Design a protein around this nucleic acid. Structure first.
Ligand SMILES: Nc1ncnc2c1ncn2[C@@H]1O[C@H](COP(=O)(O)OP(=O)(O)OP(O)(O)=S)[C@@H](O)[C@H]1O
Ligand SMILES: Nc1ncnc2c1ncn2[C@@H]1O[C@H](COP(=O)(O)OP(=O)(O)OP(O)(O)=S)[C@@H](O)[C@H]1O
Ligand SMILES: Nc1ncnc2c1ncn2[C@@H]1O[C@H](COP(=O)(O)OP(=O)(O)O)[C@@H](O)[C@H]1O
Ligand SMILES: Nc1ncnc2c1ncn2[C@@H]1O[C@H](COP(=O)(O)OP(=O)(O)O)[C@@H](O)[C@H]1O
Ligand SMILES: [Mg+2]
Ligand SMILES: [Mg+2]
Ligand SMILES: [Mg+2]
Lengths: 338, 614, 328, 319
DNA sequence: CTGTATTTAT
DNA sequence: GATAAATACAGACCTAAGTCCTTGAATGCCGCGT
DNA sequence: ACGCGGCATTCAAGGACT
């Protein structure tokens, strides 16, 4: 399992040795540590590195996590509840679960823990892109005023949503995604420990290349194909693609084949079905655009128009609450291009 | 322009003004046709005597005319037909129209004479306190018996039967529905357009059957405390007025009991603290008849009332029924009324008898003869401006004629913006849901349907951006007309035309609620497995859930009931429960749907799994 | 304090109706109104810093005397814009008499454009009912916020942006009150950067006096004005525009970068100045004006949202170069 | 000066129904009602300053004679728009017994009735009918759409229209003759033009001109009353060349002190109400104006954005 | 617009 | 009595957001009676 | 002193915003 084998220390990390050395350099003298913002491709291992740095700074007990419930009150009388994972030396906040009220959670909880007080407690903002601009504006002074009591470490995937002052106030730690060889080595260690019979080792490289640099997805796909072949991987073992990938692929096939409003009926139907089942719209647009680009029939002009309209409707999605209102427009514009 | 004709020349002729006429617009042609007794219908049928179309006729409508063999004439044909046709319509149908007019006038005279006799008897009684001319025309001609109510005869009969058989159903404990079916409901609701006669009908049915009328205005008394106390001690109490009102005679046994006709039910306070939801619990446990009356039954505040009341939909009465009443009140008041303009009066007033009576009273002060010469000005000054329902907004906004060059002058852009502003919370959704299900008729030369759809969708994207700007922490409500344009008018103008199928309701609402529920479930699952998995909310659904299915559901598919122990170990490894398992099994889409898969699992396996987990 | 320890913006606030300059038509019209006694309901709508508040406060002083702060209901509409205000305070003040001397009542509403629509709908009858002994004055920077009904019962006076001569006279008065001197070119630059607002003039004058090493004997030149204000000099503007127009891209980038770095000028001010200069130009074709205006507007909007300064400057260079390339 | 003279609008407010100049049919109908009696329920709606409050007040005065003190209840709807008002004050006035001339009844005048909340309006529905024999309600409002449809049902829908220039000229001439003011035809025409049918604006402008300059001439009336903003905005929008639009903006709007938000809002309103331009071009200019409005409301309010909006509109018109 | 309900007509 | 005209009418109602407003319920303090 | 009795004040939910 992905959780079955996860490094619990800095010295157990095996990929991007430069990042490990940088983290140990920061951990050498921990009383002087700037605010951090872990960023890179999703699935790289940024959270694992952040928790390994926490274990290096503090004792080995940072992994003894406990969930707690802290009820909060918004501007109205509505009651809002947050699960705050906490450790004796650190606590974690994921504000993406809340909506536009992440500002309140920030300003109340972080100020409270500041008043509460190895003289600092690190707070991990796992989801920093879903933080609204108002929440970041409220967090802008919390970092600086209470810098002697609270030292934030931020987990992020793309720095574009994060505003300039927040990036300025915090140190940036780049996280390159693992290379295919390192992913294959990790998969080899897993299959060796999990006692999975391998006919050859090209299977591992194929899984590594089918994950696009993702290690979490790599391990999940490994175990997924380990259940369809009875814990014995063969050369012709099919690569397990998640359901939403298959649905998006069929969507691209339909857009490429039927460029009609009657096809737009079912296109909107599929978009609604995907959105209603906990699937973000930006991910839908990204995967849809890249799968459309992979269509061999379309020539260069169609590809360029598709990527142009993808960027335009990506901006529209980033500045719009109603996601399908932009997704349908993008699909219709692509149909008009074709 | 149009030559004059002798009166009622076009009587008994069914004329439909399908073609757009350059000389006169639709309403002017309809008025100049009704001036001579002609009948105008919106649907071409076998009974249609003549169809008037100069040019620009509907294609499907033209095929309908061709199949039904309806004669068609142009504007000049209409000009010549006005002179050609003889007076009073001769023709067999014209004779029938003559007879109908004569009977209507005869009943008008008879009721006028009856009213004069009643006034004479009242004068004699006074000789042996408010003077009659002091009273308004609405109250002085109010129906005194159920045979004078105009329209909705079936609703009146059903309500009368319900209130008559209420005692019999009470003896049966209301479990039995009865032959009519109005014996299982303790309370009845009368709802319809304002001024059609719900309150009068309720009062009259209460008076005829002998019950004691207790009237409470729900708008005046809407709080829980006042309504609670008053109406509760009213539900199970006899009438001291009913007892002291000559109980000795045995003709009316229902004199003791109460009929609580609660007027203006639509104005009660909403919410649990509001009494509109309390009355739902209140009316099922009552020992006296309840007659609730509201104007907008299809309201969110009135939802608790569908399953606890006998709905009764009073419709807008047709002008023919009110023709006799208007003729009577015109004969009595010494002002001349021509029945040809009565239909236009009702259409202008929109089936509101109270307002048409008020119009007759107010106009007659100066002008003693309401005729075809001043009907246009009367209509243009007295027309009801009623906010269109979110379905009629979708229909009209998605219409080719509205955005045409000729139609633009008739229906201006500011009118379109106001049409949006009638409902500013549902029109953008309705247009978005039904802008790509219409056959366009304003396509530019060299533009296909798909291009118009793409431009409209781009416009709706800009409108959604504008809406987010309006409905955010900045509250830029001064951009609301811009949102009206961007969301409703421009996208509809791009794809304007004829409605292909039906106007559906916005599906975004239900799917958004489903998304919120699934996000709540995913939040619970993610926070349950947080200790085991270092992921976010979205990443769990993206990646782990497919593998979680393979570690939970597939073992039940292949190993059988013996894989229960391993499944339980897997759930306990991440603190999952049966509810968590069910929620994850509902998260997959497309090829990996498990709704049929779980059904095909033997019931023994599922039962053993449940017992073992417990 | 002694009104000497206050900012020059509040220190030099007019106290009598004769110290308000620029709005001569409004001043004389209002003076004749009060002198003859037919003072109607006033509506002073104009740009900020045009003296509307100063004008109405001088009106209160000239009408009621030194005790004008107790015989006048001066309400900050931004601070209290509720319908409760209209129901209680405004209505009770209008209905009742004066506790001090016999006479009419004046209610000054400052920044009434922030009043809620319900408040204005309540006021449109309070104004009419108590017109016999009470007069209303409405001050609002924006007239669209005010309800049309409230714009029908009040006589409208427009406060134009302060012209050159009035600003020169006020600058001379300020220079006499202090011990300071201004060069004609420095005064011209201050007038140009004022944009018709005396608030900016006074703020910049105070800032330049602070900038002066020994304000007793030195003079505020145009260099001091431009440095303290931070606005770009016209010479730098002309040099940058000339370099972009008829020079190579490398030289144009070098010139823009050195101009920005040497004096610390912001890029947005450079764009505004370049727009001002090129507007004065006479252009052969319409398309170049359209392209220039559109691209520069998007560049300014993106700067308002922030971003990469160098990229935005290069975008300005490219837009200008392409627009004048269309003129061939 | 310690004391003030009464404004001409209130001093010369019509005290009889005959003095009202506009809406001849409605005034004659109300005069016939006043003479005969039995006043029906009504809502009077229209534009500001065309004589709605004056008409209802004259009707009440003439109908009730010496009994105006008790038979008339004056309640500004905006001031008193609560359900408590309907429950206590209106109800007690309606149930009040008062001996009147035979035809006449007690009159309730609710000025600015458009601002009444939903609860009070709904509560008034049964008070309107229950006590109709003794009490007759009258409503005056700017917009009748704010009044609920059932309340409109119970009353006569008497709708007013914008005053014609001839009637405003007649009233202005009457006041001029009564108060001995020197005038010119051009000045009176300009006052009528600036009033745009609002008689109250016309009389206030006449007052201002007379008091400030003493002569009603076109020059003075234009200096004291500026030209209407929508007309200059429309001229800017409908100019043939881009440079002409830029010049009109710079001279008439930006340099004269008009704000960016006012300019863009008036441009949007003019564009939506324009008739010569085809609807599609009108809509796309509305789109550009809305984008400029969004930028101004976000905070970029400058001459540059207005010039860019003009450039986009001119490109749109130039194909 | 399509689908359901009610009243006058054949 | 069934099937056509002839037409009125129902399809449906969401979650946030800032600020003012109103309405009813729950709350408090203060005056009168015993 | 000690307990209710209205009446002022504070709290909470719903609706609207061009
Ligand atoms: N069908 C009708 N026939 C004859 N007169 C009617 C009819 N409907 C209404 N009226 C007249 O209108 C008056 C008022 O009728 P109501 O029953 O109060 O109207 P409504 O349907 O209850 O609508 P409301 O009162 O606005 S909820 C009656 O007294 C009659 O004079
Ligand atoms: N016409 C003027 N004459 C002299 N000083 C002036 C004039 N206009 C503005 N000032 C100065 O600028 C200061 C601000 O004037 P105010 O009248 O408060 O501005 P404003 O016109 O009311 O605009 P606001 O406050 O944004 S609505 C005054 O105290 C004076 O020092
Ligand atoms: N250096 C490493 N060596 C071995 N496994 C790693 C390493 N870095 C990450 N992983 C694997 O990645 C998984 C967690 O990935 P995660 O940190 O959640 O991705 P993200 O960067 O998106 O947070 C762990 O189960 C762990 O096995
Ligand atoms: N038709 C008219 N004839 C004469 N004077 C009028 C007319 N309309 C308005 N006025 C003048 O306008 C002033 C106030 O108008 P008012 O009736 O309050 O406007 P509204 O109808 O908007 O309430 C009155 O003093 C009156 O002299
Ligand atoms: Mg009723
Ligand atoms: Mg001010
Ligand atoms: Mg009025």
């Amino acid at each position: 399992w992905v959780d079955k084998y996860r490094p619990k220390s800095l010295n157990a990390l095996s990929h991007n040795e430069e990042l490990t050395n940088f983290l140990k350099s920061l951990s050498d003298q921990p009383r002087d540590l700037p605010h951090l913002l872990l960023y890179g491709p999703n699935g790289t291992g940024k959270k694992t590195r952040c928790m390994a740095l926490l274990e290096s700074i503090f004792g080995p007990g940072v992994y003894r996590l406990k969930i707690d419930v802290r009820q909060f009150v918004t501007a109205s009388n509505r009651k809002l509840e947050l699960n705050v994972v906490s450790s004796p030396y650190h606590l974690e906040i994921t504000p993406s679960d809340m909506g536009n009220n992440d500002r309140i959670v920030i300003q109340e909880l972080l100020k409270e823990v500041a008043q509460m007080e190895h003289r600092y407690k690190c707070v991990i903002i796992n989801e920093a892109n879903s933080l609204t601009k108002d929440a970041q504006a409220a967090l802008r002074r919390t970092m600086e005023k209470y810098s002697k009591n609270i030292r934030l470490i931020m987990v992020c995937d793309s720095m574009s949503p994060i505003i300039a002052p927040i990036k300025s106030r915090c140190l940036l730690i780049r996280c390159p995604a693992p290379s295919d060889s390192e992913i294959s080595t990790i998969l080899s260690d897993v299959v060796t420990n999990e006692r999975i019979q391998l006919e050859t080792k090209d299977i591992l490289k194929r899984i590594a290349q089918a994950s696009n640099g993702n290690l979490r997805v790599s391990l999940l796909m490994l175990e997924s194909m380990a259940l369809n072949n009875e814990l014995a991987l063969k050369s012709s073992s099919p690569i397990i693609k998640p359901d939403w990938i298959i649905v998006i692929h069929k969507l691209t096939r339909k857009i490429v084949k039927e460029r009609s409003v009657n096809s737009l009926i079912e296109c909107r139907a599929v978009l609604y079905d995907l959105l209603a089942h906990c699937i973000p719209a930006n991910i839908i647009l990204k995967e849809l655009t890249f799968s459309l680009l992979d269509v061999e029939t379309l020539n260069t002009t169609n590809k360029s128009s598709i990527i142009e309209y993808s960027s335009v409707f990506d901006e529209r999605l980033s500045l719009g609450n109603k996601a399908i209102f932009h997704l349908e427009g993008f699909i219709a514009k692509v149909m008009c291009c074709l | 322009s149009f030559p004059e004709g002798k009166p009622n020349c076009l009587l008994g002729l069914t004329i439909v003004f399908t073609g757009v006429l350059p000389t006169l617009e639709r309403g002017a042609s309809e008025a100049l046709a009704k001036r001579y007794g002609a009948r105008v219908t919106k649907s071409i049928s076998s009974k249609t005597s003549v169809v008037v179309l100069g040019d620009e006729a509907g294609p499907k409508k033209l095929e309908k005319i061709k199949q039904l063999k309806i004669k068609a004439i142009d504007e000049e044909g209409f000009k010549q037909l006005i002179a050609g046709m003889p007076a009073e319509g001769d023709g067999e149908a014209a004779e029938k129209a003559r007879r109908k007019l004569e009977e209507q006038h005869n009943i008008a005279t008879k009721e006028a004479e009856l009213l004069v006799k009643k006034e004479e008897e009242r004068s004699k009684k006074l000789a042996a306190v408010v003077r009659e001319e002091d009273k308004l025309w609405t109250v002085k001609y109010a129906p005194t018996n159920l045979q004078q109510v105009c329209g909705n005869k079936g609703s009146v009969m059903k309500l009368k039967n319900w209130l008559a058989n209420w005692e019999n159903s009470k003896k049966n404990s209301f479990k039995h529905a009865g032959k009519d079916g109005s014996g299982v409901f303790r309370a009845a609701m009368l709802y319809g357009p304002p001024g059609i006669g719900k309150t009068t009908a309720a009062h009259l049915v209460a008076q005829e059957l002998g019950y004691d009328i207790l009237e409470q205005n729900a708008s005046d008394v809407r709080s829980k405390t006042l309504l609670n106390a008053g109406v509760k001690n009213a539900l199970d109490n006899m009438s001291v007025v009913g007892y002291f009102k000559h109980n000795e005679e045995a003709q009316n046994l229902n004199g003791k009991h109460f009929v609580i006709i609660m007027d203006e039910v639509d104005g009660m306070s909403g919410g649990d603290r509001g009494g509109v939801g309390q009355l739902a619990q209140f009316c099922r446990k009552t020992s006296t008849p309840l007659i609730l009356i509201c104007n907008e039954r299809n309201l969110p505040k009135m939802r608790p009332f569908d399953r606890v009341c006998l709905d009764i939909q009073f419709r807008r009465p047709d002008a023919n029924s009110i023709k006799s009443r208007l003729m009577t009140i015109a004969i009595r008041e010494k002002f001349k009324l021509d029945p040809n303009v009565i239909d236009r009066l009702i259409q202008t007033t929109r089936g509101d008898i109270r307002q048409v009576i008020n119009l007759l009273s107010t106009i007659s002060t100066t002008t003693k003869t309401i005729n075809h010469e001043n009907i246009n000005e009367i209509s243009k000054a007295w027309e009801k401006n009623i906010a269109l329902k979110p379905f009629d907004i979708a229909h009209k906004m998605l219409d080719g004629q509205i955005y045409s060059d000729i139609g633009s002058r008739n229906f201006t852009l500011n009118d379109k913006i106001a049409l949006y502003f009638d409902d500013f919370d549902f029109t953008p959704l309705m247009i978005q849901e039904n802008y790509l299900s219409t056959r366009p008729s304003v396509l530019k030369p060299g533009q296909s349907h798909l291009e118009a759809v793409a431009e409209a969708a781009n416009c709706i994207s800009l409108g959604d951006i504008v809406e987010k700007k309006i409905r955010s922490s900045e509250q830029l409500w001064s951009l609301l007309p811009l949102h009206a344009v961007l969301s409703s008018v421009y996208p509809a103008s791009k794809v304007a035309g004829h409605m292909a199928g039906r106007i559906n309701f916005t599906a975004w609402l239900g799917q958004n609620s489903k998304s919120a529920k699934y996000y709540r479930l995913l939040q619970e699952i993610h926070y349950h497995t947080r200790l085991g998995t270092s992921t976010d909310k979205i990443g769990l659904r993206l990646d782990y859930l497919p593998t979680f299915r393979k570690r939970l559901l597939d073992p039940f598919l292949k190993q059988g009931a013996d894989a229960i122990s391993s499944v339980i170990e897997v759930m306990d490894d991440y603190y999952l429960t049966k509810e968590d398992w069910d929620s994850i099994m509902e998260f997959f889409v497309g090829p990996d749907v498990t709704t049929a898969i779980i059904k095909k699992i033997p019931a023994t396996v599922k039962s053993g799994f449940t017992r073992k987990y417990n | 304090r002694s009104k000497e320890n206050l900012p020059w913006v509040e220190k030099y606030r007019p106290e009598t109706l004769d110290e308000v300059y620029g709005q001569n038509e409004v001043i004389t019209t209002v003076r004749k109104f009060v002198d003859e006694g037919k003072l109607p309901h006033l509506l002073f709508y104009g740009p900020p810093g045009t003296g509307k508040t100063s004008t109405i406060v001088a009106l209160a002083r000239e009408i009621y005397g030194k005790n004008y702060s107790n015989m006048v209901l001066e309400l900050n509409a931004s601070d209290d814009r509720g319908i409760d205000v209209v129901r209680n305070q405004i209505k009770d003040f209008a209905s009742t008499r004066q506790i001090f001397s016999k006479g009419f009542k004046l209610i000054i509403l400052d920044e009434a454009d922030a009043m809620t629509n319900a408040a204005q709908n309540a006021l449109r009858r309070v104004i009419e009912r108590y017109t016999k002994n009470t007069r209303f004055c409405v001050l609002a920077n924006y007239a669209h916020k005010l309800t049309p009904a409230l714009l029908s019962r009040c006589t409208r006076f427009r406060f134009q942006p302060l012209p050159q001569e009035a600003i020169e006279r006020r600058i001379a008065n300020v220079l006499v009150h202090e011990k300071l001197k201004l060069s004609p070119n420095a005064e011209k630059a201050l007038i140009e950067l004022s944009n018709g607002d005396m608030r900016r003039v006074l703020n910049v004058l105070q800032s330049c006096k602070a900038t002066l090493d020994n304000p007793d004997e030195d003079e505020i030149s145009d260099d001091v004005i431009y440095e303290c204000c931070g606005a770009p000099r016209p010479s730098d503007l002309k040099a940058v525009l000339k370099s972009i127009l008829e020079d190579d891209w490398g030289t144009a980038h070098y010139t823009l970068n050195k101009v920005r770095s040497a004096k610390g000028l912001a890029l947005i001010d450079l764009i505004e100045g370049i727009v001002k200069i090129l507007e004065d130009y006479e252009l052969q074709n319409e398309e170049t004006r359209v392209h220039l205006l559109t691209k520069l507007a998007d560049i300014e909007y993106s700067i308002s949202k922030g971003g990469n300064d160098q990229i935005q400057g290069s975008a300005v260079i490219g837009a200008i170069k392409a627009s004048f390339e269309n003129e061939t | 000066t310690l004391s003030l003279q009464l404004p001409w609008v209130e001093k010369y407010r019509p005290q009889v129904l005959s003095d009202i100049v506009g809406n001849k049919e409605t005034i004659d109908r109300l005069q016939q009602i006043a003479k005969d009696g039995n006043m029906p329920h009504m809502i009077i709606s229209g534009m500001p300053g065309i004589g709605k409050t004056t008409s209802v007040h004259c009707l009440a005065h003439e109908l009730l004679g010496r009994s105006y003190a008790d038979g008339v209840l004056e309640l500004n709807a905006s001031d008193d728009r609560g359900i408590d008002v309907v429950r206590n004050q209106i109800k007690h006035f309606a149930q009040k017994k008062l001996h009147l001339p035979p035809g006449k009844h007690k009159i309730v005048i609710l000025d600015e009735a458009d601002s009444m909340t939903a609860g009070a309006q709904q509560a008034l529905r049964r008070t309107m009918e229950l006590y109709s024999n003794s009490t007759r309600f009258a409503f005056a409002c700017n917009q009748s759409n704010k009044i609920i449809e059932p309340l409109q049902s119970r009353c006569a829908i008497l709708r007013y229209s914008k005053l014609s220039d001839e009637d405003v000229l007649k009233r202005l001439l009457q006041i001029i003759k009564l108060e001995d003011v020197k005038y010119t035809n051009d000045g009176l025409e300009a006052i009528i033009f600036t009033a745009e049918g609002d008689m109250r604006q016309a009389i206030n402008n006449l007052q201002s001109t007379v008091a400030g300059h003493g002569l009603v001439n076109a020059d003075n009336v234009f200096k004291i009353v500026d030209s209407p903003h929508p007309l200059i905005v429309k001229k800017m929008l409908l100019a043939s060349n881009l440079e002409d639009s830029i010049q009109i903006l710079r001279t008439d709007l930006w340099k004269k002190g008009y704000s960016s938000i006012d300019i863009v809002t008036t441009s949007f309103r003019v564009t939506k109400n324009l008739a010569q331009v085809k609807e599609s071009v009108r809509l796309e200019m509305i789109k550009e104006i809305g984008l400029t409005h969004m930028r101004i409301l976000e905070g970029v309010g400058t001459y540059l954005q207005l010039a860019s909006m003009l450039a986009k509109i001119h490109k749109l018109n130039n194909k």
